[PDB]
Amino acid sequence: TSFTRNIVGRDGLCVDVRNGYDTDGTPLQLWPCGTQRNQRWTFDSDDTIRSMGKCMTANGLNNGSNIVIFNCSTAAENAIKWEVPIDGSIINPSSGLVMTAPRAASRTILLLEDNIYAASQGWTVTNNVKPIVASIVGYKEMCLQSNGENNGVWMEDCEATSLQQQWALYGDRTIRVNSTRGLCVTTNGYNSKDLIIILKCQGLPSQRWFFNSDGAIVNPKSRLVMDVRASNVSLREIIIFPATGNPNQQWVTQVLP
Ligand SMILES: *[C@@H]1O[C@H](CO)[C@@H](O[C@@H]2O[C@H](CO)[C@@H](O[C@@H]3O[C@H](CO[C@H]4O[C@H](CO)[C@@H](O)[C@H](O)[C@@H]4O)[C@@H](O)[C@H](O[C@H]4O[C@H](CO)[C@@H](O)[C@H](O)[C@@H]4O)[C@@H]3O[C@@H]3OC[C@@H](O)[C@H](O)[C@H]3O)[C@H](O)[C@H]2NC(C)=O)[C@H](O[C@@H]2O[C@@H](C)[C@@H](O)[C@@H](O)[C@@H]2O)[C@H]1NC(C)=O
Ligand SMILES: *[C@@H]1O[C@H](CO)[C@@H](O[C@@H]2O[C@H](CO)[C@@H](O)[C@H](O)[C@H]2NC(C)=O)[C@H](O[C@@H]2O[C@@H](C)[C@@H](O)[C@@H](O)[C@@H]2O)[C@H]1NC(C)=O
Ligand SMILES: *[C@@H]1O[C@H](CO)[C@@H](O[C@@H]2O[C@H](CO)[C@@H](O)[C@H](O)[C@H]2NC(C)=O)[C@H](O)[C@H]1NC(C)=O
Ligand SMILES: *[C@@H]1O[C@H](CO)[C@@H](O)[C@H](O[C@@H]2O[C@@H](C)[C@@H](O)[C@@H](O)[C@@H]2O)[C@H]1NC(C)=O
């Protein structure tokens, strides 16, 4: 069984076989999303990921290796098999390494690296290649709000016209300021009680998030979750904290018109 999708990652750019060339060994790169065949990836039961009839292929199996296009039958079986874990990683199970966009720019070549749960290692397999713009509603049915670069995020009464309450949910599993998409919801550290702020997107593990099945927003590296500090909205502090199941750790996205 198979299905075809784009693969969206860092900065909303897509996995692209350079200029539609399919010569074995051509590096895969980031490029703005489109519908051309060199961004259309077919996922099959054999765990291959194919474009133009050739495979997404690990050029070697150690950290820092290139990912390239390659003839499926002549490439090593270990090099051409991939899985897609629920948290947005794309993993080569033979090596345990994960697909990585080591820099943000278009034309960045993609690498296989040790998983560090970086935003540079988050991907979304989808035909919708535009970020989803949403409100993020939490404790006391208030809305998460941005308050400028380098400042804390916090909760306020929802307002449909408030630009500061609008979030672009990018394919790399980042949560961006919708009006200023170079800025990311960022934990200022990986320890319990570290503050959530807005910082320039830099592909960091502190900028990667996962909306889990329990209503939590999880930072995969820390394992900790977004938390309205001390269940007190007047503190105007959102932190990471261990998952407790409490209402101050529950969030829902609401798509905006
Ligand atoms: C798993 O594989 C990963 C991908 O290869 C490894 O990550 C790389 O590790 C490289 C080091 O081995 C690292 O390269 C160096 O990066 C230095 C910093 O560059 C940044 O900052 C610069 C400003 O100061 C800026 O210009 C850059 O754009 C970067 O933002 C850089 O200074 C180093 O260059 C010095 O030394 C070289 C000599 O080798 C000089 O040529 C250079 O002028 C300068 O004097 C160096 O850059 C590399 O230089 C050689 C060139 O061929 C390379 O292309 C160039 O990158 C590189 O940044 C990262 N890449 C990524 C994606 O992170 C990873 O290594 C580890 O993790 C990194 C972050 C680092 O902490 C390493 O020490 C860790 O080992 C691998 N994992 C493991 C466990 O090995
Ligand atoms: C919830 O957050 C509020 C903002 O920090 C707290 O109010 C502040 O409490 C301070 C005590 O450390 C006190 O000096 C301040 O006067 C007060 N207000 C501001 C704007 O700083 C609040 O503290 C308690 O609850 C409210 C209802 C007030 O009665 C306070 O005086 C209480 O100490 C925080 N705590 C709770 C549990 O609500
Ligand atoms: C979120 O930000 C986006 C991107 O800036 C806004 O979408 C743009 O809006 C203008 C006016 O409608 C359009 O001309 C552009 O084509 C849009 N750009 C992109 C990149 O799609 C949008 O208004 C913002 N707010 C919401 C609720 O999405
Ligand atoms: C991968 O390499 C093998 C052997 O070196 C080629 O036979 C493949 O050729 C392709 O598949 C066969 C079925 C035939 O239709 C041929 O015309 C195709 O090009 C090659 N695979 C590709 C996609 O280049």
From Swiss-Prot:
User: Where are this protein's 2-alpha repeats?
Assistant: 140-177
Q: Where are the 2-gamma repeats?
A: 222-249
2-beta repeat residues? 181-219
- The 1-beta repeats are at 52-92
1-gamma repeat boundaries on the chain: 95-127
Residues modified by carbohydrate are N63, N71, N178, N232
Each 1-alpha repeat occupies one of these ranges, namely 11-51
What residues does the Ricin B-type lectin domain cover? 1-126, 129-254
Where are the disulfide bridges?
C14-C33, C55-C72, C143-C158, C184-C201
Entry protein name: Nigrin b B chain
Q: Describe which stretch of the whole protein the shown chain covers, with first residue, last residue and complete length.
A: 306 to 562 of 563
